[PDB]
Design a protein around this nucleic acid. Sequence first.
DNA 1: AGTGTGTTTTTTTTT
DNA 2: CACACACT
Lengths: 438, 207, 668
Amino acid sequence: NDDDNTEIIKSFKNFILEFRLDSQFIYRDQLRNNILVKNYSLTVNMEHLIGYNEDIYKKLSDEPSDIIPLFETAITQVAKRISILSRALNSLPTFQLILNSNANQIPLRDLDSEHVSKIVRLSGIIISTSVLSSRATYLSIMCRNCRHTTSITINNFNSNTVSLPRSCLSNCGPDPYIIIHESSKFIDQQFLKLQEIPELVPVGEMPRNLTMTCDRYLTNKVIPGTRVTIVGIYSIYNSKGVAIRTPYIKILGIQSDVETSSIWNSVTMFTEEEEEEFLQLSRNPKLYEILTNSIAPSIFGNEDIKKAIVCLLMGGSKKILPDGMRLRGDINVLLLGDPGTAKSQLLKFVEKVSPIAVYTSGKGSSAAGLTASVQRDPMTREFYLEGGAMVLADGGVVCIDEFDKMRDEDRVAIHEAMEQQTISIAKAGITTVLNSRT
Amino acid sequence: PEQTERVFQISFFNLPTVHRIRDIRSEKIGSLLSISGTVTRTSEVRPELYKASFTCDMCRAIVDNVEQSFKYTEPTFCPNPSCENRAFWTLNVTRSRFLDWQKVRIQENANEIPTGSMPRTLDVILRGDSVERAKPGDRCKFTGVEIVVPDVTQLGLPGVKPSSNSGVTGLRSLGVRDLTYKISFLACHVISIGNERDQEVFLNSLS
Amino acid sequence: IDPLREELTLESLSNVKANSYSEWITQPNVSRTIARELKSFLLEYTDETGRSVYGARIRTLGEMNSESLEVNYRHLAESKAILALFLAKCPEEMLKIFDLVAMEATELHYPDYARIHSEIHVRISDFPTIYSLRELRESNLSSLVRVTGVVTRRTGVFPQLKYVKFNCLKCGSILGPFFQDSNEEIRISFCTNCKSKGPFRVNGEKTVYRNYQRVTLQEAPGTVPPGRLPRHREVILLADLVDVSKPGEEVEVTGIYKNNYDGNLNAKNGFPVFATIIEANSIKRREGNTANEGEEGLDVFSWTEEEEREFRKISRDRGIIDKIISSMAPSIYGHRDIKTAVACSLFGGVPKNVNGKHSIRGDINVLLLGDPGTAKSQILKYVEKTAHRAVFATGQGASAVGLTASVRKDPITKEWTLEGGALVLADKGVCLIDEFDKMNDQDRTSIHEAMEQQSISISKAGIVTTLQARCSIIAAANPNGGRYNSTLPLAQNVSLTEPILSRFDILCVVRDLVDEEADERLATFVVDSHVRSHPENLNARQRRLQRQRKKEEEISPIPQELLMKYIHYARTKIYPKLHQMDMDKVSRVYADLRRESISTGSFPITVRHLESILRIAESFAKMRLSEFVSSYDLDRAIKVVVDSFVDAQKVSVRRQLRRSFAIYTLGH
DNA sequence: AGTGTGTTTTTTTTT
DNA sequence: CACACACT
Ligand SMILES: Nc1ncnc2c1ncn2[C@@H]1O[C@H](COP(=O)(O)OP(=O)(O)OP(O)(O)=S)[C@@H](O)[C@H]1O
Ligand SMILES: Nc1ncnc2c1ncn2[C@@H]1O[C@H](COP(=O)(O)OP(=O)(O)O)[C@@H](O)[C@H]1O
Ligand SMILES: [Mg+2]
Ligand SMILES: [Mg+2]
Ligand SMILES: [Zn+2]
Ligand SMILES: [Zn+2]
Ligand SMILES: [Zn+2]
């Protein structure tokens, strides 16, 4: 079947090489793109696969866990065929597959005991992101007394992990092949946790969360507190309760449920056009009043108030003097007046307009560490620094409710932080200082 | 099932002397003693397997009425003398005999102690009838056999880690690691040392 | 007759004729005869009907496309009962037989319904005896029995290996799939290829997976004798059965008394104790009311399409609104305006959202001021059980954290965990509030915050979650000294803050006035309540029933259950829309609202008050049950709101203001 | 003689 | 990883 598996690999490469639309082989296009910018990753649509050949897609659906490594090997061979001259391990890193399903999404809630090791399509909001964790793409070992050195290329497509080599394998022992972690090649992995569909609101049910894993060209794409529509195989491994194992997902494709673009690295997705009309609106002074009126729908007036709001959201420029000093850019607007006057409503609207910061309330926010709370980590008795609201508000225009109702003493600690535009903490013997651009 | 013998428990009532929390010395082992303990915490009902069966599939033979002292114990070998196996035995749960047990501990009362001694707690063995007979949270007058209870995890049985004191020579029941004890009492009989507002019930029950 | 797979008469099947009952049942000959009888009565035995109710459940579950196959355990003893006793003694094997017969019935009623569920479960509802955890004896072991417990854990539902294939590392690449009890590891420890012991590993070949959910149980303290700690027996939920409950909801279920081993228990006990489990073959909740069949099974309440047709028929009937006003809390004589307010709060306004983000609450916050002993708590109790989803706030008992949003440090999991905020429990349903005028002020501000957005936002202990709180709330308050002074301004009659009364859309005040003949009627009414309440009095119960029927005729013309189903129908299908409206009528209304707050007895009138009037109009229209708001129903909403405002005023200005608004009052 | 298995109060933080 | 026990 290994020859049959190679034949299936050949069939998949025949797919990618001879799938075109209007003479355009999009797959070789993205291939050469990922050659020019060396991202060893490939994106494919299963609808295209079905159109070219149902059978290969069905074989995929039967057991994706081992079909995917064959596809990665096929893509790597294809890249070797195309981007490398003919007759010219680890010489070319393997490409990894990216898939978009567009099928139905079973809710995170009501996931069956069935669908084990089955590709699934879902959506949820991230509550936590793990740091990167390398994974041995290639493994370098030596047979200890036998001195035999061998290569291993383990894929993350099983279950849990492959046990270390046993016996001499051409007594040298139950594990002579001592891993020499220099030639061995690693790729980082990141673990993810999705809350179940905040819109689903299962009444009376605590939102269940599942763990995920991401590959080097999938990791760090999105942040916690952001909803993502995911397409990854349903995954199971043993945590260390009979015949019950940890449920998780190995992701084959990442799509943003919030749909918001990633951290803006100044790459203009709006491009020159949209910014050109933006400047035209800036060129036309009337558009200033347009933005004024547009803010706070149904407010019926208060236009100069809306102008002040627009100016504040617009962001005061922080100038860094050549001196040790630095002109303070951001400002914090104070809202005093009679109740029932849409003030909190306007605050919520403004925060919805600009999500660079987060709307909160005084009582809802923890009195201690409003800017940044200090919490004891479950696995470290040291009270770590947890990012408070103005940590999140840093880099963002933030609206908070019930200032008067809040206890005054910690609000004193807020004025200093906003004044310095940072957050200086020396509590609990920890002298960390964090910026507060809000 | 009726043919299968129903186990015998013989409870002793009206015993001459009640030793109470006092007495209970080491010299007496397996001795009938009456104690006026104040048992206020008791325990939960526990199945307390008496006898059981073993598969030993690779001999295909079946034990009858395996008895273990305190720790789950298997037959010395396969029931068949052929394929006698000291390595493997598997439970057959066929001769399963159980006695509902409750590890009732007695804390001594305030009276009858001269100098403020703490409410010394002694666990007491209880039987299914006795468990239902005993009402928890209540000081009880009880009697039964006083047995020597060994400490836990001491046996070298599989699963439970053997508890790795002084010992005799010439024994071979447990040649290594010795053993330690924590005695508990067994009460054959227990009694407490210390509505119906219906017209028909009133008329019938009332004198 | 056959040694295995036999058919015999029912009598020879019944008697074991063997030393061991379970060994006799173990004979596959006996099993096959039982299978024949099982298939026979499954469809052939049509108890009390021309059709087999079990056959009716067949292909209905097929239509439901599920796996449970409820039996009810009745029509089994009724059907010659030998199978019934056999099950009650040695279930597991004939449960498997029931699964087989389910297979044949499956493909019979619905061909191709096979391979949809590879198995079809047994669901033994009901039992001769309810039993107790205190009742669990060695006899009860390995026997399915009904129980009386309280679910506590509800662990995360986990797929579990229905089949397991154990293979040794050296010899067996793949070994045959054998069933796994899910209670303990099979641990064969023997290789077919290697006679000697070797390292064993699970087979990579896929086997069936079933759900797994452990729940701790607890004996009902009321049934438990005083001073006795209820026992706690573990029960595991399985596939097609997990996530049936809520922790602490408490159920009675019939399940086999599983018994398992664990060396740690013997170690901590020093004795050959054997761990005991149950996993109910069928699940049904015990809500504790045991009033009717709703107690049996899960949850209570119902919805009927015939009932909604009746609701439509009464809706086109005029005077429905007044009947509903009489309908709400009939056991509280008088309080016509109060009844109107609470009933329309039950109906609630229509939620409104602007641009996706901007939103208007569809829930009504009733502020009530009541003298002590004015049925306020009992009014709340009548309100609940009528709006289905409901909560009760003791007021003083709850706090800022407790009611709105709570986080609980969880030592067992080792992280901070969310604790159920009672206002989150309020969300999606009506919120009862009592003793609020006496409870903590910081908690009051927390409630203000929570209600302003109809959602609670909490960021502490690493939990930054925000929970929607859609709940119609009704605060209960006592006047300063328990008696409202009409000459006194409301704010002076109120010991609480001004902002809270502003955010409250409905204000309610209870006062003691001369009302002599009314006090005659009220005392007589309470006497009647006692008399109908007394079991001692066709018979006495018949005359109690007829007197409550006639009182239902005068007030609450719709039955209370019919009433609550009417409310459910209104929420579910009725959504009146303001398509037509009177702009300038509302304009002049708010104009008059102005220059009145200048009065010392007058609280400020704001925009949110106008939104309150709008949502009161929505609640009235929902109460009218029409999918389109009526202008004149909206007019009655205006009338109710303006009357509440006038009552809120000082009596001195109140008369001048009522004359001023008289130009509005007549239109109603 | 097989081969298996075990050792690294305080202090904020709520409130 | 690697060395005292309990039989292997
Ligand atoms: N000028 C206005 N135009 C439109 N709507 C208004 C206006 N003034 C008040 N409102 C409405 O009245 C509501 C009351 O405001 P809220 O959003 O509850 O918060 P707020 O105005 O800050 O009230 P407090 O001070 O927190 S009680 C608003 O949501 C609006 O819907
Ligand atoms: N109009 C009424 N009709 C019937 N019962 C009434 C009426 N007004 C008050 N009650 C009775 O008053 C009692 C006190 O109710 P509750 O709300 O607990 O009083 P409090 O005013 O002290 O909060 C209730 O048992 C209720 O039946
Ligand atoms: Mg506000
Ligand atoms: Mg009350
Ligand atoms: Zn070697
Ligand atoms: Zn044997
Ligand atoms: Zn083998």
